Amino acid sequence: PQIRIRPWWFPVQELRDPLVFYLEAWLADELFGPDRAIIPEMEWTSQALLTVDIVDSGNLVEITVFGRPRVQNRVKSMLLCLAWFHREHRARA
Amino acid sequence: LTFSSYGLQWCLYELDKEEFQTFKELLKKKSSESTTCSIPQFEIENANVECLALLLHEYYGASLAWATSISIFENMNLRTLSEKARDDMKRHSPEDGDTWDYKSHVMTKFAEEEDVRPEMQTLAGAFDSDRWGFRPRTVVLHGKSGIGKSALARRIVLCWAQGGLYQGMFSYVFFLPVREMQRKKESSVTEFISREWPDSQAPVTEIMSRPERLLFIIDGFDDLGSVLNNDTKLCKDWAEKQPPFTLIRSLLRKVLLPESFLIVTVRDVGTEKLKSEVVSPRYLLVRAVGSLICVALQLQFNQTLTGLHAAFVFHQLTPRGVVRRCLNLEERVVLKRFCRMAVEGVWNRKSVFDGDDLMVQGLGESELRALFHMHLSLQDFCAALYYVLKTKRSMELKQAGFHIHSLWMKRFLFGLVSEDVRRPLEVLLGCPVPLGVKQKLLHWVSLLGQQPNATTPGDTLDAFHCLFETQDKEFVRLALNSFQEVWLPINQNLDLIASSFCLQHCPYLRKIRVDVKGIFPRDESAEACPVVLWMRDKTLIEEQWEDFCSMLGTHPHLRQLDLGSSILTERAMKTLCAKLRHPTCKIQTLMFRNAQITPGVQHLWRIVMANRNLRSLNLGGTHLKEEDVRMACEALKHPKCLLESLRLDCCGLTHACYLKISQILTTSPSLKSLSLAGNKVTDQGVMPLSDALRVSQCALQKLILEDCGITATGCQSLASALVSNRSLTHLCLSNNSLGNEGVNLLCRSMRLPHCSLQRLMLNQCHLDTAGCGFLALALMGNSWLTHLSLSMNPVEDNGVKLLCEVMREPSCHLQDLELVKCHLTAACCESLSCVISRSRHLKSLDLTDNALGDGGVAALCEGLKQKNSVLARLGLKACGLTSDCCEALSLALSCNRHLTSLNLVQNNFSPKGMMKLCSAFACPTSNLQIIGLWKWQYPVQIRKLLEEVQLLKPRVVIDGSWHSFDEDDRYWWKN
Amino acid sequence: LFWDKEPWFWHDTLTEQLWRIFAGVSRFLQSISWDPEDFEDAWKRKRLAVPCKLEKMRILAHGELVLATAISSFTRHVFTCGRRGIKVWSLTGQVAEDRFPESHLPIQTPGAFLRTCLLSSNSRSLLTGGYNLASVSVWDLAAPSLHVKEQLPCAGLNCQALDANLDANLAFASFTSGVVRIWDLRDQSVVRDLKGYPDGVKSIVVKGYNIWTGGPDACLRCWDQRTIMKPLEYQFKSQIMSLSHSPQEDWVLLGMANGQQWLQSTSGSQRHMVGQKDSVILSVKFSPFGQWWASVGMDDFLGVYSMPAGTKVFEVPEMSPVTCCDVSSNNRLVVTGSGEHASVYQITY
């Protein structure tokens, strides 16, 4: 059981049908930072709720997005593009 | 790094596709001008919005990329997006004794009564301060019903009792269950605090001593709301006795004990009802479907969840130790009672049953326990099963009609009409079941179909989901027999599956569009996903997209295919076209204007070459390579091509491109139309076209050149071609600064009697009085040209006088003339009235955005009054009409018979004038089949008057948006 | 809604039929659409096109007289104001008329009222003020829970107009004693005071360094913040009821209380009437892109006008006088308030 804060400006109706997808742990670490301090601003500017969790094994990272389906797809695509940029940047350095 | 590009990406998404292309071109220019930093051109071209933002940040840097985007935004005349971008940059760019005994006794009590029947870190942080700076006093929890809210609250109380949770904040805890309050009609907090203590006596002064020492817990607010709905004045005094609902209301509103702090547990419907009561709360979201699903799988219809639940429930209903035994009468009666209780719980939005209500129903406890094993999903399924087998109006009707939780019951009701899940029910019960709900669902879907407008996207998707659940061919065919064209957005794979199944059985599907975004698999290279090789490539989504494309191709009765707004991967286009190539396809029109298909264009021409039934093909806003144009030209030359229309918009073609287009124009026999609108067409590109048209072989019948920026040299080239040519019939040259000289050259070319074109249009061509004089001189003595338009040109009163003088001889054969925004006045209207009364060949006229006023319209009414006039349609709009002119117009319409269409919008009419107008409308003498007016713009008396006019003469149609049911050719020719 | 005989949804009829079965005893309204790709209106034969159609799509029951409104499109909420409190609505659900606010922000003080409200352009704060109230209060909308984050002091003053400029982090307010105060939101400290006109100023509009104010004295003044010069007055023949500014081109719109609308230029003293009615104009609002404006008056009518010359494209009637209007930043939604209700219309073109 996981308990999360949700802002007053997100309707309860959108909570239905979330979307899930995984990534690498280190890559998520540099995507959001060790503190996860930028999630509120991204949520406000995108008008969708994120959630980042670490699998028990510690190898994969689960990301879940709440919102209208097109916003879910859009956020997924943006995060994936950033992930690729970080992967190729790691390869470059 | 990512945080700054995220906001930029979200700013660019506001720009449209055309705006996006303009942005990319302006960025190209900016990069070319600068020398310090460089960008490859092909990389700017190939990138989409997300790649564009990330590339911009990679090269320029955070602040520099933001500033560049802001400046470009300002350049395109966008000012709001500039300020939004500046703000989002400001935000995204980083700056550079007795109490102990009581609590122990409570521990023992709740431990015992809970024995009868990780997150702690978060719960300990509930009352802490955030980075904003804020200390909440009320906290509300909501989530799925599987978790026990009572258990969570009691464990919170337990942790407080041991002291590992909130040791330093407060000294007292009061747990409040709602059912127990409902058990007593009269109650007070004093009675509660006396109840909780063992000795049943407490120091009231000590309890009220301090605010911070008290905490209250309210559980199951949603279980009862009927009593709380009542309105009563709140109680300031804590000790006073009042109804429990009043106490709860006062406590939540913070009128009672305003200084204490609370915590509440509720469900989704409960928080829907409760959000209006609490003040400045903090919401916490908590998240047995998986256990139920695996248990059902163990006790096994794989296509749908309704089949799985039906299998589980029917298996449970079988007598224990016996297989497929017929139920006895009492078993059926108790099952009906159970199902009715389930539907009552659904309607009343309560999932907790008490013993007394069970006694009221009359079913036995052991039999009930035998019938049910565990959940709201099972409750909804049982309600649907009820539908398979109180007050006239109630609030429960509208509450359950909210269809957030009723959606599942509707889905199961739809899924229960299938025969595969029907036969187990038939064998289990042993009796045949007649039902009329099937007819009701059929009528519901048909009623959706019978709407006059095109089916709404979301409604269509939901209906398709329901029909896919049904899985009955005859039922689906009877359901979809109604509507002919659909609009079908697609977001997920389940959408593809449902659409693929449902669209095979639409017998009379004629048109369709599809919005496809976000479905396609991540690119196999550079975007690998650890969770997703089978998922990355050759994924099930690819197979089911292939199935969808196959069914789109094989459909016999489909004729037009459209792509509203789609992001197509080159592989998606590959498979789509491959399924479109096969000759069995019958799709005639294709439209890719709004879709982004730049990477996948190369796979398009094969269908044009091979498919024999294609007739029209539209492209726009895409960029075309020279090799792409060469391939298109080669495909057009092939003797097996029968394409009859080709439209290329904003494609940005090179000169050699126009050379190849000229060559195909002289080569291809079948092509009868061609459009180059928005492209840059220099006069050097006009000359090859003139050479192509001069040849006697060309069979082009229409030609559109919009915003092409041609000059007088182009005009003389086209004029010479026109002299030579005898095939072209329609010609359009709008938004081109031709000028009086170019109009004179065209005039000289049309002066000859052997010109054979019938329709010419010239809007925003910088005409004047002299050009209108040239046109007047050319028009006399010409019998072929029939439709002429001159709008948005300052052709003054005098020019219109010349035109009218020319047109007034019968010899002239001009039927349609429409001019808009030409700065006319009353005398021009008098001359036009003489023209209308006398002439015989004119059948259409248009005067829009001209300040004719009352005098001009009076002269026109005198003109139309004559029974000799044969004018068919008249266009008036934004002409500043008033009462007297409308009275004269009403009399004119009363006198006329030939007029059919009219238009009076954006005009100011007083109620009396409208009474006159409606009285004129209702007369049998006048037969107007189309009228331009907004019904909702006028008072109730006028609205009912117009409706009364409408019920008379059922053929008449009043619709504000003119061009309704007008001739299709007029607008189709233009584009 | 009220205009039609009865508003129905697509699933509502199925719910009704199932209710009848259980008890034993165009044509369908649409919801409001957000995505630009869904909008899908054909081109006439971001965008500066003048609108051409309207349709009511919700009614909001406030329970008491509505004095002001505000609409946000980045977030879906709507804000309604009354003499006793503010109520926040949500536009995401689907229902003909809603009775359950997303939130309620009451103000309790003996003899305290509310007159005005104002939503910042970025949709991240909200200003509030009234009579006999200790100070002007600003709410924080971006935080996870609503709460007052700042208090802007004013003792024994009755504010009647509010305005805010976010680029320079300034907030303005006009009081019944003919005094205008300017606050700096970072420190919440008064900056400068403008006074000298007893009748007060009912409306104030701020763009650049110029504050435009108009009141019953039948004068329109233009203060400059950079200096202490006397304002430039433009005398009119009637008493002004509202003001608005053109965002793109230099033009100030105003209503005259005798059913007349005028345009005024900052650079020079040119005027020309752009519309006339038989009623009193209580509010005029400009479109974000500046090619049209909305007007609401006392004779139960909502109208839309065309910028180039003032032609009125269309108007809609109502049962009770309207007193306030607002236009969304999407240029697609407009909200007006009459009696004890607030209505929402969608713009299509």
Side-chain angles (χ1 to χ4, degrees), chain A, chain B residues 1-322 325-530 539-964 968-975, chain C residues 1-4 6-349:
Chain A
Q2 284 79 239
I3 301 173
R4 192 182 189 275
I5 177 68
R6 67 156 266 256
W8 77 270
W9 47 257
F10 187 80
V12 186
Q13 317 169 12
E14 265 79 60
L15 294 167
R16 314 271 80 71
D17 321 327
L19 178 144
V20 180
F21 64 98
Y22 297 177
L23 281 102
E24 296 108 318
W26 54 273
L27 184 129
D29 194 1
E30 41 265 27
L31 272 158
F32 311 107
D35 205 284
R36 273 69 159 167
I38 57 174
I39 305 301
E41 305 282 285
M42 302 193 327
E43 287 189 352
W44 162 255
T45 190
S46 181
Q47 302 280 290
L49 308 184
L50 281 75
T51 292
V52 183
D53 285 328
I54 318 294
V55 77
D56 56 353
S57 81
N59 303 54
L60 302 193
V61 163
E62 180 168 89
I63 304 96
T64 73
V65 180
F66 285 118
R68 54 194 306 136
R70 64 165 296 147
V71 175
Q72 309 177 38
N73 301 321
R74 171 171 290 186
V75 169
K76 170 152 160 36
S77 68
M78 330 221 300
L79 271 44
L80 258 294
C81 172
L82 280 162
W84 162 243
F85 178 93
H86 278 286
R87 186 151 47 236
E88 71 99 35
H89 185 193
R90 162 196 76 64
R92 281 157 68 214
Chain B
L1 275 70
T2 77
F3 181 44
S4 148
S5 77
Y6 196 82
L8 190 50
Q9 286 177 358
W10 211 269
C11 290
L12 296 174
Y13 262 121
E14 258 191 60
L15 297 174
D16 210 338
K17 191 165 66 94
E18 173 89 347
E19 280 138 14
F20 193 50
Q21 288 297 107
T22 308
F23 182 85
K24 289 169 78 165
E25 154 53 20
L26 183 39
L27 201 43
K28 278 157 110 194
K29 180 163 71 70
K30 288 275 192 176
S31 72
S32 76
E33 279 171 334
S34 183
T35 60
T36 57
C37 181
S38 67
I39 312 177
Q41 303 282 71
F42 87 126
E43 182 55 25
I44 292 169
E45 294 284 59
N46 84 317
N48 86 77
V49 82
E50 288 157 308
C51 304
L52 193 172
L54 202 43
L55 152 62
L56 203 61
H57 266 160
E58 175 304 300
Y59 273 103
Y60 300 81
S63 68
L64 311 93
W66 274 96
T68 299
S69 271
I70 289 178
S71 83
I72 302 187
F73 296 153
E74 177 59 30
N75 270 353
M76 291 145 278
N77 155 288
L78 314 164
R79 73 140 198 94
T80 74
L81 182 63
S82 79
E83 300 328 346
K84 164 166 154 56
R86 197 160 300 126
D87 170 37
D88 291 10
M89 166 179 208
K90 194 185 295 295
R91 168 161 64 259
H92 284 89
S93 175
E95 193 261 335
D96 287 331
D98 57 278
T99 49
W100 209 266
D101 190 75
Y102 158 75
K103 72 202 281 168
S104 69
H105 193 269
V106 167
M107 215 295 310
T108 310
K109 285 197 288 181
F110 69 63
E112 288 166 9
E113 80 181 3
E114 81 178 4
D115 297 333
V116 159
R117 185 64 183 269
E119 317 94 42
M120 291 325 98
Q121 272 63 14
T122 307
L123 295 163
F127 281 103
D128 306 50
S129 84
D130 53 4
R131 65 188 291 266
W132 285 259
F134 180 56
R135 319 274 282 291
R137 302 265 74 178
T138 175
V139 169
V140 182
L141 285 45
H142 43 56
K144 47 110 171 183
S145 311
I147 197 68
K149 306 288 169 55
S150 56
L152 188 64
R154 294 152 165 169
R155 285 168 68 81
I156 291 165
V157 176
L158 172 63
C159 292
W160 180 76
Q162 271 91 25
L165 181 141
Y166 287 142
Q167 54 270 20
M169 286 197 100
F170 52 89
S171 292
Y172 322 121
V173 165
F174 295 156
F175 174 109
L176 184 42
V178 293
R179 279 83 57 86
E180 279 74 359
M181 331 214 82
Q182 271 295 294
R183 293 296 179 268
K184 289 181 279 292
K185 205 270 273 183
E186 292 287 328
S187 176
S188 182
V189 67
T190 45
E191 279 84 318
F192 176 91
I193 61 170
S194 74
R195 196 272 298 276
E196 296 283 327
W197 285 24
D199 54 354
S200 181
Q201 281 85 58
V204 294
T205 62
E206 196 276 332
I207 302 297
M208 291 208 55
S209 61
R210 271 83 47 77
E212 185 69 26
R213 306 283 108 189
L214 292 168
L215 165 63
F216 303 71
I217 297 96
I218 302 94
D219 187 10
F221 182 83
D222 59 329
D223 295 333
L224 63 98
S226 79
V227 188
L228 289 157
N229 290 326
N230 201 354
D231 301 318
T232 51
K233 297 298 183 185
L234 309 176
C235 50
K236 292 287 188 71
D237 280 328
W238 70 303
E240 187 65 24
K241 291 171 72 67
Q242 287 291 315
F245 82 91
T246 279
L247 275 79
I248 296 297
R249 174 201 180 91
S250 304
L251 191 65
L252 283 172
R253 273 91 180 290
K254 299 303 295 180
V255 166
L256 176 64
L257 294 170
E259 216 169 343
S260 181
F261 54 103
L262 281 83
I263 185 168
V264 175
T265 55
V266 72
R267 275 163 63 237
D268 42 37
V269 294
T271 200
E272 189 87 20
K273 270 302 205 93
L274 170 68
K275 40 178 193 163
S276 147
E277 322 296 334
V278 295
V279 72
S280 180
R282 174 171 279 174
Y283 299 97
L284 270 62
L285 173 71
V286 188
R287 55 175 272 146
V289 176
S291 71
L292 193 136
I293 282 175
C294 78
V295 166
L297 283 155
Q298 288 155 25
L299 269 291
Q300 286 296 92
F301 295 149
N302 64 324
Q303 68 280 12
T304 48
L305 73 163
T306 194
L308 180 131
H309 275 182
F312 188 68
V313 165
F314 297 157
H315 196 173
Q316 290 292 317
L317 259 288
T318 56
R320 272 67 179 191
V322 179
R325 167 73 70 225
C326 173
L327 296 195
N328 215 345
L329 189 145
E330 66 274 17
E331 312 185 75
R332 287 189 276 117
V333 167
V334 300
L335 185 58
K336 189 176 284 188
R337 288 175 186 267
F338 183 22
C339 294
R340 185 162 182 82
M341 280 280 291
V343 307
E344 298 209 358
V346 160
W347 282 104
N348 305 324
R349 277 157 64 159
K350 61 194 297 294
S351 171
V352 178
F353 302 124
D354 286 328
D356 48 358
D357 304 344
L358 194 150
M359 291 266 147
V360 170
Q361 194 68 37
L363 73 163
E365 299 86 0
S366 70
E367 301 92 302
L368 167 66
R369 173 59 183 86
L371 291 170
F372 90 91
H373 205 237
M374 304 315 191
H375 205 286
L376 60 94
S377 67
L378 271 292
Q379 173 162 16
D380 296 330
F381 184 10
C382 287
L385 195 53
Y386 168 84
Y387 285 111
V388 166
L389 292 156
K390 254 72 75 172
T391 59
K392 184 80 163 181
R393 177 225 66 87
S394 167
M395 171 215 67
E396 319 303 329
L397 191 166
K398 67 181 178 71
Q399 281 192 0
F402 199 57
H403 82 274
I404 48 166
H405 55 91
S406 185
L407 182 65
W408 298 107
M409 176 178 73
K410 294 186 185 352
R411 153 181 311 290
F412 294 160
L413 180 50
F414 262 101
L416 271 158
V417 308
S418 176
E419 196 275 339
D420 67 340
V421 301
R422 183 182 300 279
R423 49 94 185 179
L425 188 148
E426 178 73 24
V427 68
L428 186 50
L429 263 73
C431 301
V433 56
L435 51 85
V437 289
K438 176 174 278 193
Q439 299 175 358
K440 300 272 191 176
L441 305 162
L442 182 67
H443 174 52
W444 185 57
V445 178
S446 295
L447 185 52
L448 171 73
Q450 275 116 23
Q451 103 177 348
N453 302 326
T455 72
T456 306
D459 304 342
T460 306
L461 196 55
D462 297 345
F464 281 177
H465 274 308
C466 288
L467 272 292
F468 171 59
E469 202 76 18
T470 292
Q471 305 266 321
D472 172 353
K473 295 182 178 67
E474 297 256 350
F475 182 84
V476 175
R477 304 259 181 146
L478 292 171
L480 308 172
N481 174 77
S482 172
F483 54 80
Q484 309 271 305
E485 30 179 294
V486 313
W487 179 359
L488 183 77
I490 301 190
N491 303 122
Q492 293 252 39
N493 183 316
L494 315 99
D495 307 343
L496 272 83
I497 291 156
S499 312
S500 321
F501 169 85
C502 270
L503 274 178
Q504 309 195 147
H505 294 320
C506 194
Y508 291 179
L509 181 72
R510 303 320 282 288
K511 301 159 135 185
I512 185 170
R513 86 168 75 181
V514 295
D515 310 31
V516 181
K517 324 167 92 184
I519 87 185
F520 295 108
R522 287 303 332 175
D523 189 22
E524 295 73 48
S525 300
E527 274 91 8
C529 182
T539 313
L540 198 58
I541 193 67
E542 309 187 14
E543 200 265 309
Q544 291 173 353
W545 177 240
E546 166 167 336
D547 299 357
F548 184 67
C549 290
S550 86
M551 71 65 67
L552 269 186
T554 193
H555 205 270
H557 283 227
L558 178 66
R559 263 71 170 84
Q560 171 166 356
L561 191 151
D562 186 351
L563 269 69
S565 286
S566 306
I567 306 296
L568 273 298
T569 48
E570 55 208 62
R571 313 155 77 207
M573 277 279 294
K574 248 178 294 194
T575 181
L576 173 61
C577 295
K579 298 293 107 175
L580 264 286
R581 288 203 281 256
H582 309 357
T584 62
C585 181
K586 317 295 256 170
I587 287 164
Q588 288 183 358
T589 306
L590 289 157
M591 331 195 78
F592 294 148
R593 160 45 162 197
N594 283 345
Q596 283 214 290
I597 59 168
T598 313
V601 281
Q602 311 87 310
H603 307 285
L604 199 172
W605 314 120
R606 293 202 33 88
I607 61 171
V608 173
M609 187 171 6
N611 198 2
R612 185 152 291 85
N613 220 331
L614 178 74
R615 292 290 176 271
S616 178
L617 171 54
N618 180 348
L619 309 158
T622 180
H623 192 111
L624 288 174
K625 195 210 155 171
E626 290 191 354
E627 289 295 330
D628 299 318
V629 172
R630 190 178 65 79
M631 185 54 242
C633 291
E634 298 164 73
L636 262 289
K637 297 161 164 102
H638 182 67
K640 301 294 184 184
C641 187
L642 275 78
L643 186 134
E644 273 165 13
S645 174
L646 210 83
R647 287 166 67 61
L648 313 161
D649 276 349
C650 316
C651 290
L653 294 90
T654 311
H655 213 276
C657 298
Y658 294 129
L659 190 140
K660 284 152 291 153
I661 315 202
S662 54
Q663 162 227 55
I664 56 169
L665 226 37
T666 172
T667 311
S668 59
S670 310
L671 190 65
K672 296 193 295 185
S673 167
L674 181 58
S675 171
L676 303 164
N679 296 340
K680 61 103 173 178
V681 179
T682 53
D683 296 310
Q684 289 64 32
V686 174
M687 301 165 238
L689 295 173
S690 174
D691 293 333
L693 317 149
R694 286 167 79 93
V695 178
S696 73
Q697 293 170 354
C698 76
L700 192 73
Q701 292 183 356
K702 311 172 196 287
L703 162 72
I704 291 97
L705 303 171
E706 188 97 21
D707 294 29
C708 282
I710 56 200
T711 65
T713 49
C715 284
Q716 60 82 19
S717 304
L718 203 171
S720 147
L722 215 80
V723 178
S724 149
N725 190 1
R726 287 185 183 269
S727 77
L728 183 83
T729 301
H730 299 55
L731 181 70
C732 166
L733 300 157
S734 283
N735 262 325
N736 290 345
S737 65
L738 297 198
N740 284 311
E741 30 260 36
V743 168
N744 192 4
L745 325 190
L746 273 299
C747 160
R748 273 199 288 249
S749 151
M750 323 152 34
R751 177 63 269 175
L752 292 57
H754 292 357
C755 198
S756 173
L757 72 84
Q758 302 225 70
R759 301 217 276 166
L760 178 73
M761 89 148 48
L762 308 154
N763 314 318
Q764 185 64 60
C765 281
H766 293 104
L767 212 73
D768 202 355
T769 63
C772 182
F774 278 140
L775 268 169
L777 190 59
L779 152 74
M780 43 183 49
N782 197 9
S783 84
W784 310 118
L785 184 143
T786 306
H787 290 50
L788 176 73
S789 88
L790 311 151
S791 305
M792 269 153 266
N793 291 328
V795 82
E796 293 299 19
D797 300 327
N798 52 66
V800 173
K801 292 173 230 152
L802 331 173
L803 262 165
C804 289
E805 201 47 50
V806 165
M807 150 149 39
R808 284 152 30 61
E809 310 82 278
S811 57
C812 185
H813 293 353
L814 193 72
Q815 282 184 1
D816 182 90
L817 162 79
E818 51 105 4
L819 73 89
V820 166
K821 253 183 91 173
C822 292
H823 307 67
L824 303 190
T825 196
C828 175
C829 292
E830 188 272 346
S831 190
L832 282 164
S833 74
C834 289
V835 161
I836 291 156
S837 60
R838 179 68 272 179
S839 69
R840 291 175 277 234
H841 270 289
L842 186 78
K843 292 288 285 185
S844 163
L845 189 68
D846 183 294
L847 300 100
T848 306
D849 320 59
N850 304 316
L852 314 190
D854 274 29
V857 172
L860 268 160
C861 301
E862 307 177 17
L864 282 165
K865 195 205 101 199
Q866 309 274 283
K867 60 186 180 291
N868 191 4
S869 66
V870 70
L871 195 69
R873 53 169 264 165
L874 173 61
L876 264 74
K877 193 174 74 146
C879 291
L881 309 200
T882 62
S883 189
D884 287 336
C885 59
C886 87
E887 186 276 338
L889 185 145
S890 79
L891 203 30
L893 306 184
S894 174
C895 295
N896 172 283
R897 201 259 288 152
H898 319 78
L899 185 72
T900 70
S901 176
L902 189 53
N903 193 2
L904 304 99
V905 186
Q906 292 204 30
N907 290 301
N908 197 356
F909 288 126
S910 66
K912 300 169 70 176
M914 301 275 288
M915 282 145 48
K916 295 209 212 74
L917 258 57
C918 297
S919 181
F921 283 0
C923 187
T925 309
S926 52
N927 54 6
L928 294 166
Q929 323 153 353
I930 289 166
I931 311 174
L933 273 170
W934 284 125
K935 281 176 183 286
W936 42 265
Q937 170 172 340
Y938 299 107
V940 165
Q941 167 173 53
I942 299 307
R943 287 210 301 275
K944 304 303 102 173
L945 184 60
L946 269 302
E947 261 295 320
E948 170 179 356
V949 170
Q950 169 76 84
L951 65 89
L952 284 161
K953 297 192 182 78
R955 204 71 201 261
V956 184
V957 84
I958 296 93
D959 270 317
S961 64
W962 209 42
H963 326 311
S964 85
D968 47 13
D969 199 15
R970 159 185 312 272
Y971 311 91
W972 168 225
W973 154 56
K974 193 170 83 70
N975 57 3
Chain C
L1 265 290
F2 198 62
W3 187 81
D4 269 335
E6 181 63 20
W8 258 3
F9 281 86
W10 178 41
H11 293 88
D12 207 356
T13 180
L14 179 71
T15 301
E16 180 71 28
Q17 285 311 292
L18 289 182
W19 168 261
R20 301 294 181 94
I21 295 296
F22 159 64
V25 178
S26 68
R27 289 261 86 87
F28 289 159
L29 172 61
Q30 293 294 129
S31 65
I32 88 179
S33 52
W34 308 100
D35 303 334
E37 56 179 15
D38 174 342
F39 154 80
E40 286 294 320
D41 282 9
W43 176 53
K44 187 263 177 189
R45 286 178 285 267
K46 187 177 297 301
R47 198 69 261 155
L48 301 193
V50 177
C52 69
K53 178 192 179 18
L54 264 186
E55 60 268 19
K56 174 143 63 180
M57 281 155 88
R58 203 170 289 232
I59 287 280
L60 315 176
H62 190 263
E64 62 204 320
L65 191 83
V66 177
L67 297 179
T69 54
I71 208 174
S72 169
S73 274
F74 180 52
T75 49
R76 280 78 152 253
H77 300 92
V78 175
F79 303 89
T80 312
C81 177
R83 304 179 115 248
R84 314 181 61 51
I86 287 169
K87 308 181 101 164
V88 185
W89 308 87
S90 180
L91 296 178
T92 188
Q94 298 55 30
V95 72
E97 177 166 353
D98 57 39
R99 274 85 88 193
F100 295 122
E102 184 99 356
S103 288
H104 172 53
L105 313 177
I107 284 141
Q108 200 282 306
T109 290
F113 322 119
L114 280 186
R115 280 188 56 109
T116 49
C117 178
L118 178 129
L119 174 71
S120 295
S121 83
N122 62 5
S123 300
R124 266 186 158 250
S125 63
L126 179 144
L127 272 69
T128 291
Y131 285 13
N132 298 112
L133 272 168
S135 54
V136 164
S137 176
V138 309
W139 295 90
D140 207 1
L141 301 151
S145 53
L146 273 173
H147 68 283
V148 176
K149 70 177 178 182
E150 295 164 8
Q151 283 247 321
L152 303 190
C154 54
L157 300 182
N158 304 345
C159 85
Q160 52 194 353
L162 288 166
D163 208 328
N165 192 5
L166 57 94
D167 301 300
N169 66 37
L170 283 193
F172 311 90
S174 156
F175 304 102
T176 190
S177 64
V179 163
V180 189
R181 275 197 173 177
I182 316 182
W183 291 293
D184 213 358
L185 268 57
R186 295 180 279 81
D187 163 17
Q188 307 145 211
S189 62
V190 183
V191 165
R192 203 223 173 203
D193 279 56
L194 303 80
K195 64 170 70 71
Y197 300 122
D199 77 332
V201 286
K202 276 187 40 63
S203 299
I204 68 169
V205 175
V206 175
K207 260 197 57 50
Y209 304 109
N210 293 113
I211 302 99
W212 291 73
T213 67
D217 83 8
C219 290
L220 168 60
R221 295 177 181 85
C222 190
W223 308 80
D224 54 353
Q225 287 161 214
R226 284 180 286 183
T227 54
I228 184 94
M229 313 305 207
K230 254 292 181 193
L232 271 283
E233 308 95 330
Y234 312 114
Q235 176 71 47
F236 287 69
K237 284 330 108 167
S238 189
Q239 32 199 340
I240 298 102
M241 290 286 103
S242 189
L243 298 177
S244 196
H245 209 291
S246 172
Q248 291 286 96
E249 184 179 359
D250 154 44
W251 287 116
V252 180
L253 184 55
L254 52 90
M256 294 304 300
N258 56 6
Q260 290 183 2
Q261 319 178 2
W262 290 73
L263 294 162
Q264 167 83 233
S265 51
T266 325
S267 296
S269 210
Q270 291 84 303
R271 319 180 192 181
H272 51 280
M273 187 176 293
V274 294
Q276 194 153 212
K277 299 199 281 184
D278 52 356
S279 172
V280 178
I281 278 164
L282 296 174
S283 210
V284 290
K285 190 68 161 69
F286 227 87
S287 172
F289 289 115
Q291 298 310 131
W292 57 277
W293 73 76
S295 272
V296 294
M298 193 137 190
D299 80 327
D300 314 331
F301 262 116
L302 158 70
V304 173
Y305 292 65
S306 299
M307 173 48 204
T311 310
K312 57 179 282 284
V313 176
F314 56 70
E315 73 183 2
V316 168
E318 266 140 8
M319 285 328 136
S320 317
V322 286
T323 72
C324 70
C325 74
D326 195 338
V327 184
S328 170
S329 71
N330 290 24
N331 217 11
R332 299 253 187 271
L333 299 163
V334 58
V335 53
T336 188
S338 59
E340 313 206 320
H341 299 66
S343 49
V344 186
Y345 304 92
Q346 190 174 12
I347 299 284
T348 81
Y349 53 87

